[PDB]
Amino acid sequence: EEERSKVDDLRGTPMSVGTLEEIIDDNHAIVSTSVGSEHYVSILSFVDKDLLEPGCSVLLNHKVHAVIGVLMDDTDPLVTVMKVEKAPQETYADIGGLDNQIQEIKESVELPLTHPEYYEEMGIKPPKGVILYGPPGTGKTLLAKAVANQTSATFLRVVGSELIQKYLGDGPKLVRELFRVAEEHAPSIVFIDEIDAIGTKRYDSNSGGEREIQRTMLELLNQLDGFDSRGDVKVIMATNRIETLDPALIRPGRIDRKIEFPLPDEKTKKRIFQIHTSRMTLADDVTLDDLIMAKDDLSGADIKAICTEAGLMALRERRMKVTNEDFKKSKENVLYKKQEGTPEGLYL
Amino acid sequence: MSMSGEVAKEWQELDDAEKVQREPLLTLVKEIVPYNMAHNAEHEACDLLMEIEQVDMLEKDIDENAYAKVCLYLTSCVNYVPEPENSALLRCALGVFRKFSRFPEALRLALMLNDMELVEDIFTSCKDVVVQKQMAFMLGRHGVFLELSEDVEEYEDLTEIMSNVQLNSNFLALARELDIMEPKVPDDIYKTHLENNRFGGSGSQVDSARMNLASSFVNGFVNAAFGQDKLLTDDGNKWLYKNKDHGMLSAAASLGMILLWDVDGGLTQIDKYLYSSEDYIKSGALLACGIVNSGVRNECDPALALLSDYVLHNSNTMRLGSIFGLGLAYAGSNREDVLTLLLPVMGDSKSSMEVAGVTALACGMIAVGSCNGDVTSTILQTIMEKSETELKDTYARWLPLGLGLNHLGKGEAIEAILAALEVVSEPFRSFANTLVDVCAYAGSGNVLKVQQLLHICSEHFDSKEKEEDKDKKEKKDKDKKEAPADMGAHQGVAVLGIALIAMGEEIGAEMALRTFGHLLRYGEPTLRRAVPLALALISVSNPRLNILDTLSKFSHDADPEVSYNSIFAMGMVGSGTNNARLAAMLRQLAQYHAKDPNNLFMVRLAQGLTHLGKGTLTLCPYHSDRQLMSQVAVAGLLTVLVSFLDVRNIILGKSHYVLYGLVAAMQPRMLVTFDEELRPLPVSVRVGQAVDVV
């Protein structure tokens, strides 16, 4: 009605927006525009003052630096990194041969959320997540086990995060300010993959520095301790060594378990290569026997592109069709060997 | 020619055979092979563009298929005079099939960009104008069968070429997953109608001739089938032995064995809770106390005799659920009671529904497969005795539920005699009346019914009933995709759009989230009140994530209407599976200070969302529900509705004996639930007990 038409000229038109400093029990509001300003605003309604909290942005009318009403904008650079999204088209069934290993991590993350009936009647409740890692280059393949968790509720894919090493925030509350904004939109999962904080030997380049940078990484160490860790906000860590975390951090969590990704054997190589070629039809002239037999202890990704490097040179001969000229050139890549290497060298 | 083997890469070697054609035919392929066989030479696959034409006109096969894998383009248009085209093609159709499956017995090809893309690219010109019956029938490939058909009414596509049960199993399976995206599915034998002997004969011969392994889909079909029309037509189509299959048919031993199986997996408490309510005698609500003993006992007469004896007081509408329990008790197996069931009808001028209209509904609703065929002609004759006193309004709602349910294609037409009283012209009462009155008469399907009834009813037009009248045409065609074409009008009444998306789309996947979300944001205000009503159909797929999420914001609204449609949207489709979010939400709901039945409609209806017909023995304990109904009834204090809620959660809670689930896994739709549940939205007085029958 006439409400919106009457009060639109009170705040604007060219109004400025500052930041709320503190809240007084006398109803006087102190707003700070950038930079170094104060004011007294008395408003008894439209608040919503509890959801605000200090250190937030509020409107300021031109006459005179007063707030017509408060809104929730942005909020903060950290909340934006959750989207988007992920929830891809991939599922946990798209990989195989790890079914015995994946049933431990899949059932642990599916214990909350779906099937809550036996979760609430228990009233203990291990919502600790897991910790992932493995050779030679894996540990993001264990993230492919979380692609089913990515499709479950809200997911956050994180490698090295952002604010950890680059520039610090204020306290552990950054994850906890994510927890309070998630509690409306919950559940959620926050992944951790390949931490580069301690992974780098020589940091780039010379900084403030060889000592203190360890102390601002120690800020991350206490940020994950944490005060006070209660709910989820699931935490799944992936990195080389877990020993970077102090035993004082394990006391709040997470004490559940950590798994390692073993080298997939010939039964797993053929299964991983089969499901990728299941939905999207393969070629009949290329046999899967000589591919898995000629290799020993290799991932599912490595068996894939050795057939691509054959199709790589194939287009130089200008063949989109399946041609037997590549069959020998692919068998030549089997005779080329070189798939695996590792020391050794000794006779034992 | 020597030009094909030239080291120069200059274009082009294609189409060169069109300028000079008959003269190069004197040569053979002997000159072509040294160019393509020798490697490290120019124009390897480029020479195949000229070679594909030479091997096509020579009728040689498997050579053209191998050389056309590179082209993928010139295969479509290739040398045009149609006489050589359709000649060599039919020779290629029979010549490619003989080159495949020669092992014999597969291995299957080996969809693909070689064999499937070549036969599809030529299939374009095939399905356009000339000839017929391409390689899809000859080769028997089920992958090309998806691309074999063209856009047409699927009602004539139910027939197929007969073959062995081996290939028929893969043909029916891959066609089923093809028809889930299509309006019609192989499971349409339920809905269709049809009604010809075809589906009855083809349905009984799928298990032929084995009579042992056929226990499934036959013996399990007749016991889970509520209507007699399924056990009727199939009786003449069941050739086992002679005439003595009536024992398992008629739903006598069928319903009798599954009812004892429910007592096995049961059972419901009888003496404890009910006789404790007898010490409390009759509650002051006179609302949900009638339907209590209905489903419970079943079969016992003494509790049935107390019902019939008390309801002779005639007070209000209380007789509704009780007299419904008179027939339902004996009719749990067969037949039954249909003789004395219709006696109180003419023995009690009604003059309203709450007096003599109850027992008139009994024979109609408790029928469940009758017809038989005396009940049909009896109900139609019984309504001819009471006309002016019914009249056009209150009892005209329940009567169609006794015909279209059992038989959708029934030849007896009850619409003509029931439409003569329309002259009352009242726009208000006719809304909730004529809604399901003309809809539940029959399933229609002839498309001629909507045209007839509209001309005689409108005449003119009613300016109101024409809203719901067009919804009957939308409900007539089931998931036929014509509904998205009928929403272009979008009248200000807005009742068309909500009923169009719900019933107009029946499919496994939702697919309606784009249309459902569009009408709420673009629609006018007060339309969002009736928007959640569509959640009772398309949400049967994933009731967990979609329901409670969107309904969490609408459940806390202070407006009574949108708060009433919120919990209702969850309703039965949300009560099929339990959850911890539905249990944790129960808190703070009963602590609200809001008045009116909407406050307790939220909480108490959600109390039955923990299970449907499950327990209590076996399994979930009843002590949890008894403590919740006792503590919440101490407030207000009366407020007689606190005695309505404690008897409400035990309506479906303590009845049991029916596990639904869905109803049903066969994907039917209960017409008693969707009918009554639309009335509580403009709730006034007695529209609440009409829904209490369920």
From Swiss-Prot, chain A:
Topology within the bilayer: Lipid-anchor
Keyword rRNA-binding: no
GO cellular component: cytosol; membrane; nucleoplasm; nucleus; proteasome accessory complex; proteasome complex; proteasome regulatory particle, base subcomplex
Cellular compartments annotated: Cytoplasm; Nucleus; Membrane
Signal peptide, first to last residue: none
Biological process per Gene Ontology, one example term: proteasome-mediated ubiquitin-dependent protein catabolic process
Organism superkingdom: Eukaryota
Chain positions with Phosphothreonine modification: T342
Modification sites for N6-acetyllysine: K166
Residues the record lists as Phosphotyrosine modifications: Y347
Keyword set, alphabetical order: Acetylation, ATP-binding, Cytoplasm, Deafness, Intellectual disability, Isopeptide bond, Lipoprotein, Membrane, Myristate, Nucleotide-binding, Nucleus, Phosphoprotein, Proteasome, Ubl conjugation
Ligand binding (ATP): G134, P135, P136, G137, T138, G139, K140, T141
Listed Basic and acidic residues bias regions: 1-11
GO molecular function: ATP binding; ATP hydrolysis activity; proteasome-activating activity; RNA binding
Keyword Phosphoprotein tagged: yes
Residues in cross-link Glycyl lysine isopeptide (Lys-Gly) (interchain with G-Cter in ubiquitin): K145
Disease: Birk-Aharoni syndrome: An autosomal recessive disorder characterized by failure to thrive, severe developmental delay, intellectual disability, spastic tetraplegia with central hypotonia, chorea, hearing loss, micropenis and undescended testes, as well as mild elevation of liver enzymes.
Subunit structure: Component of the 19S proteasome regulatory particle complex. The 26S proteasome consists of a 20S core particle (CP) and two 19S regulatory subunits (RP). The regulatory particle is made of a lid composed of 9 subunits, a base containing 6 ATPases including PSMC1 and few additional components. Interacts with SCA7. Interacts with NGLY1. Interacts with PAAF1.
Role of this protein: Component of the 26S proteasome, a multiprotein complex involved in the ATP-dependent degradation of ubiquitinated proteins. This complex plays a key role in the maintenance of protein homeostasis by removing misfolded or damaged proteins, which could impair cellular functions, and by removing proteins whose functions are no longer required. Therefore, the proteasome participates in numerous cellular processes, including cell cycle progression, apoptosis, or DNA damage repair.
Annotated family: Belongs to the AAA ATPase family.
Protein name (database record): 26S proteasome regulatory subunit 4
GN (gene name): PSMC1
Range within the parent protein: 93 to 440 of 440
UniProtKB/Swiss-Prot annotation, chain B:
Keyword S-adenosyl-L-methionine among record annotations: no
Sequence positions bearing Phosphoserine: S202, S204
Per-repeat ranges for PC: 250-283, 284-320, 321-355, 358-392, 401-430, 533-564, 583-598
Tissue-wise expression: Found in skeletal muscle, liver, heart, brain, kidney, pancreas, lung and placenta.
Single GO MF descriptor: enzyme regulator activity
PTM annotation (Phosphotyrosine): residues: Y35
Gene Ontology biological process: proteasome-mediated ubiquitin-dependent protein catabolic process; regulation of protein catabolic process
Chain positions found as N6-acetyllysine: K392
Domain of life: Eukaryota
Region (Disordered): 464-486
Gene Ontology cellular component terms for the protein in this record: cytosol; extracellular exosome; extracellular region; ficolin-1-rich granule lumen; membrane; nucleoplasm; nucleus; proteasome accessory complex
Renumbered residue ranges of the record's region Required for interaction with UBLCP1: 549-694
Chain intervals with Basic and acidic residues compositional bias: 464-484
Record keywords, A-Z: Acetylation, Phosphoprotein, Proteasome, Repeat
Recorded family membership: Belongs to the proteasome subunit S2 family.
Subunit annotation: Component of the 19S proteasome regulatory particle complex. The 26S proteasome consists of a 20S core particle (CP) and two 19S regulatory subunits (RP). The regulatory particle is made of a lid composed of 9 subunits, a base containing 6 ATPases and few additional components including PSMD2. Interacts with RPGRIP1L. Interacts with CRY1 in a KDM8-dependent manner.
Role summary: Component of the 26S proteasome, a multiprotein complex involved in the ATP-dependent degradation of ubiquitinated proteins. This complex plays a key role in the maintenance of protein homeostasis by removing misfolded or damaged proteins, which could impair cellular functions, and by removing proteins whose functions are no longer required. Therefore, the proteasome participates in numerous cellular processes, including cell cycle progression, apoptosis, or DNA damage repair. Binds to the intracellular domain of tumor necrosis factor type 1 receptor. The binding domain of TRAP1 and TRAP2 resides outside the death domain of TNFR1.
Protein name in UniProt: 26S proteasome non-ATPase regulatory subunit 2
Natural source organism: Homo sapiens
Origin organism lineage: Eukaryota, Metazoa, Chordata, Craniata, Vertebrata
Coverage span on the entire protein: 165 to 853 of 908
